[PDB]
Amino acid sequence: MNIVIVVFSTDEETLRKFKDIIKKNGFKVRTVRSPQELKDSIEELVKKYNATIVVVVVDDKEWAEKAIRFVKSLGAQVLIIIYDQDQNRLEEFSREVRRRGFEVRTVTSPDDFKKSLERLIREVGSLEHHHHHH
């Protein structure tokens, strides 16, 4: 199943690690910087659904809300990995995302993201479909 990543780090270096670990597994990436950049992903998915992990890059927690408020409108079940340097923020924003029916996973360091992503990808469903009819 699909997965979303919310990054509070406006610094490219941190996001770079995330993008590298993703493509490592063979998945495509979309870094959202505007609301239409999120919706437009769905506009594509309804036409062609290929393995693309959408990473919403946020500068504040309400802009992060804006994204989750749209995803809430989608209704589907997706895993949401969020990164922030303050547990007070990260863990509390997690409250909202989780309450809205989305199982959110919080990461504090690139290596912790690396490990957790490797796990989730194999659990939720990787590019390796496994169950084949042939």
Side-chain angles (χ1 to χ4, degrees):
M1 182 49 177
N2 186 31
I3 180 175
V4 182
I5 303 177
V6 181
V7 181
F8 284 72
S9 298
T10 60
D11 302 89
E12 196 285 314
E13 300 184 90
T14 301
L15 182 62
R16 182 172 300 228
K17 280 65 179 183
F18 288 47
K19 300 176 297 177
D20 193 88
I21 306 169
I22 297 178
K23 60 180 177 61
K24 190 236 73 176
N25 291 272
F27 294 86
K28 305 185 74 291
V29 185
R30 187 175 181 144
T31 62
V32 177
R33 66 284 297 200
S34 296
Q36 180 177 30
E37 286 286 59
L38 183 61
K39 180 179 181 301
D40 186 82
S41 183
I42 290 66
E43 305 298 300
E44 285 297 283
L45 295 177
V46 64
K47 303 285 78 180
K48 55 175 175 300
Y49 42 95
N50 185 30
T52 297
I53 302 181
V54 54
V55 182
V56 184
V57 184
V58 300
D59 48 356
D60 70 89
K61 47 79 64 176
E62 293 188 85
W63 168 224
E65 292 186 71
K66 295 281 293 186
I68 307 300
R69 296 176 186 172
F70 180 79
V71 183
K72 174 59 187 174
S73 183
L74 302 178
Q77 58 273 30
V78 295
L79 288 300
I80 301 181
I81 303 179
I82 305 180
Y83 179 93
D84 185 74
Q85 294 185 89
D86 296 284
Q87 292 297 92
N88 178 269
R89 308 178 180 242
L90 184 61
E91 216 293 282
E92 197 57 63
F93 181 62
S94 171
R95 209 85 57 229
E96 290 300 285
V97 183
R98 185 176 181 161
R99 173 169 62 117
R100 305 176 188 235
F102 304 105
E103 299 191 272
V104 52
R105 293 295 174 88
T106 57
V107 292
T108 58
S109 297
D111 289 70
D112 294 84
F113 174 78
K114 178 173 56 188
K115 301 176 183 176
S116 60
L117 185 65
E118 293 289 296
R119 302 302 299 200
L120 295 179
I121 293 181
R122 298 181 177 237
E123 301 182 84
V124 69
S126 72
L127 71 173
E128 180 177 75
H129 305 292
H130 300 101
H131 48 76
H132 54 84
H133 293 226
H134 174 76

